[PDB]
Design a protein around this motif. Structure first.
Motif, PDB file in Angstrom:
ATOM      1  N   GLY A   1       0.827  -1.238   0.000  1.00 38.04           N
ATOM      2  CA  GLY A   1       0.000   0.000   0.000  1.00 38.04           C
ATOM      3  C   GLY A   1       0.843   1.261   0.000  1.00 38.04           C
ATOM      4  O   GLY A   1       1.942   1.276  -0.562  1.00 38.04           O
ATOM      5  N   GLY A   2       0.320   2.316   0.634  1.00 35.38           N
ATOM      6  CA  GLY A   2       1.030   3.586   0.706  1.00 35.38           C
ATOM      7  C   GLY A   2       0.094   4.780   0.768  1.00 35.38           C
ATOM      8  O   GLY A   2       0.266   5.656   1.616  1.00 35.38           O
ATOM      9  N   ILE A   3      -0.904   4.793  -0.142  1.00 38.95           N
ATOM     10  CA  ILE A   3      -1.933   5.864  -0.267  1.00 38.95           C
ATOM     11  C   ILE A   3      -1.361   7.302  -0.209  1.00 38.95           C
ATOM     12  O   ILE A   3      -1.181   7.932  -1.255  1.00 38.95           O
ATOM     13  N   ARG A   4      -1.082   7.808   1.001  1.00 43.28           N
ATOM     14  CA  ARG A   4      -0.545   9.160   1.179  1.00 43.28           C
ATOM     15  C   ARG A   4       0.972   9.127   1.372  1.00 43.28           C
ATOM     16  O   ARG A   4       1.474   8.576   2.359  1.00 43.28           O
ATOM     17  N   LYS A   5       1.692   9.714   0.407  1.00 43.40           N
ATOM     18  CA  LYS A   5       3.159   9.774   0.438  1.00 43.40           C
ATOM     19  C   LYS A   5       3.666  11.089  -0.156  1.00 43.40           C
ATOM     20  O   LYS A   5       2.956  11.745  -0.921  1.00 43.40           O
ATOM     21  N   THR A   6       4.907  11.454   0.204  1.00 45.79           N
ATOM     22  CA  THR A   6       5.565  12.684  -0.278  1.00 45.79           C
ATOM     23  C   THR A   6       5.970  12.569  -1.757  1.00 45.79           C
ATOM     24  O   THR A   6       5.841  13.520  -2.531  1.00 45.79           O
ATOM     25  N   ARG A   7       6.465  11.378  -2.110  1.00 48.09           N
ATOM     26  CA  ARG A   7       6.935  11.026  -3.464  1.00 48.09           C
ATOM     27  C   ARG A   7       5.934  11.335  -4.592  1.00 48.09           C
ATOM     28  O   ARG A   7       6.345  11.763  -5.670  1.00 48.09           O
ATOM     29  N   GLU A   8       4.629  11.127  -4.332  1.00 44.52           N
ATOM     30  CA  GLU A   8       3.576  11.289  -5.353  1.00 44.52           C
ATOM     31  C   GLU A   8       3.354  12.761  -5.658  1.00 44.52           C
ATOM     32  O   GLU A   8       3.174  13.161  -6.812  1.00 44.52           O
ATOM     33  N   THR A   9       3.373  13.546  -4.584  1.00 46.02           N
ATOM     34  CA  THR A   9       3.207  14.994  -4.626  1.00 46.02           C
ATOM     35  C   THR A   9       4.344  15.628  -5.452  1.00 46.02           C
ATOM     36  O   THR A   9       4.104  16.275  -6.488  1.00 46.02           O
ATOM     37  N   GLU A  10       5.586  15.412  -4.983  1.00 40.78           N
ATOM     38  CA  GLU A  10       6.789  15.902  -5.662  1.00 40.78           C
ATOM     39  C   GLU A  10       6.813  15.384  -7.101  1.00 40.78           C
ATOM     40  O   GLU A  10       7.231  16.095  -8.009  1.00 40.78           O
ATOM     41  N   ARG A  11       6.359  14.122  -7.274  1.00 35.14           N
ATOM     42  CA  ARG A  11       6.259  13.469  -8.591  1.00 35.14           C
ATOM     43  C   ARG A  11       5.516  14.365  -9.587  1.00 35.14           C
ATOM     44  O   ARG A  11       5.923  14.451 -10.743  1.00 35.14           O
ATOM     45  N   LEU A  12       4.428  15.038  -9.126  1.00 37.80           N
ATOM     46  CA  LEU A  12       3.675  16.001  -9.973  1.00 37.80           C
ATOM     47  C   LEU A  12       4.672  16.966 -10.566  1.00 37.80           C
ATOM     48  O   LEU A  12       4.798  17.170 -11.777  1.00 37.80           O
ATOM     49  N   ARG A  13       5.361  17.534  -9.599  1.00 29.62           N
ATOM     50  CA  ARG A  13       6.356  18.557  -9.770  1.00 29.62           C
ATOM     51  C   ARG A  13       7.600  18.061 -10.532  1.00 29.62           C
ATOM     52  O   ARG A  13       8.149  18.793 -11.361  1.00 29.62           O
ATOM     53  N   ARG A  14       8.034  16.827 -10.246  1.00 29.74           N
ATOM     54  CA  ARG A  14       9.201  16.228 -10.907  1.00 29.74           C
ATOM     55  C   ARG A  14       8.895  15.849 -12.374  1.00 29.74           C
ATOM     56  O   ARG A  14       9.569  16.337 -13.285  1.00 29.74           O
ATOM     57  N   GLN A  15       7.879  14.982 -12.594  1.00 30.50           N
ATOM     58  CA  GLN A  15       7.502  14.541 -13.956  1.00 30.50           C
ATOM     59  C   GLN A  15       6.014  14.168 -14.066  1.00 30.50           C
ATOM     60  O   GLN A  15       5.365  14.501 -15.061  1.00 30.50           O
ATOM     61  N   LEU A  16       5.486  13.478 -13.041  1.00 31.11           N
ATOM     62  CA  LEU A  16       4.083  13.018 -13.012  1.00 31.11           C
ATOM     63  C   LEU A  16       3.067  14.180 -12.922  1.00 31.11           C
ATOM     64  O   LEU A  16       3.439  15.347 -13.066  1.00 31.11           O
ATOM     65  N   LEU A  17       1.786  13.835 -12.686  1.00 31.13           N
ATOM     66  CA  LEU A  17       0.693  14.814 -12.611  1.00 31.13           C
ATOM     67  C   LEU A  17       0.478  15.360 -11.188  1.00 31.13           C
ATOM     68  O   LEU A  17       0.920  14.766 -10.205  1.00 31.13           O
ATOM     69  N   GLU A  18      -0.237  16.501 -11.131  1.00 30.14           N
ATOM     70  CA  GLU A  18      -0.588  17.250  -9.895  1.00 30.14           C
ATOM     71  C   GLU A  18      -1.184  16.366  -8.776  1.00 30.14           C
ATOM     72  O   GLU A  18      -2.413  16.356  -8.610  1.00 30.14           O
ATOM     73  N   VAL A  19      -0.365  15.597  -8.001  1.00 36.47           N
ATOM     74  CA  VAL A  19      -1.027  14.730  -6.995  1.00 36.47           C
ATOM     75  C   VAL A  19      -1.471  15.472  -5.679  1.00 36.47           C
ATOM     76  O   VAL A  19      -2.610  15.939  -5.613  1.00 36.47           O
ATOM     77  N   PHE A  20      -0.563  15.651  -4.679  1.00 37.87           N
ATOM     78  CA  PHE A  20      -0.839  16.449  -3.462  1.00 37.87           C
ATOM     79  C   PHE A  20      -0.442  17.867  -3.739  1.00 37.87           C
ATOM     80  O   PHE A  20      -1.217  18.825  -3.722  1.00 37.87           O
TER      81      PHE A  20
END
Length: 52
Positions: A1-20
């Motif tokens: 699992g994981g659900i809420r993490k820092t990586r996903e948020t920054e990921r928006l910012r790094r390459q992925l989409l607007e998460v947190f």
């Protein structure tokens, strides 16, 4: 699992989409809020990205 993490948020910012870190107001807002997880997001990405 994981659900809420820092990586996903920054990921928006790094390459992925607007998460947190990305969500509408939430995007920079994550750290300017009260929770620690959000705090890391702009703190880590917005502060490092803006300075570097």
């Amino acid at each position: 699992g994981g659900i809420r993490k820092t990586r996903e948020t920054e990921r928006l910012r790094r390459q992925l989409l607007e998460v947190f870190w990305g969500q509408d107001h939430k995007v920079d807002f994550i750290l300017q809020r009260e929770p620690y997880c959000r705090d890391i997001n702009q703190l880590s990405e917005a502060l490092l990205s803006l300075n570097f």
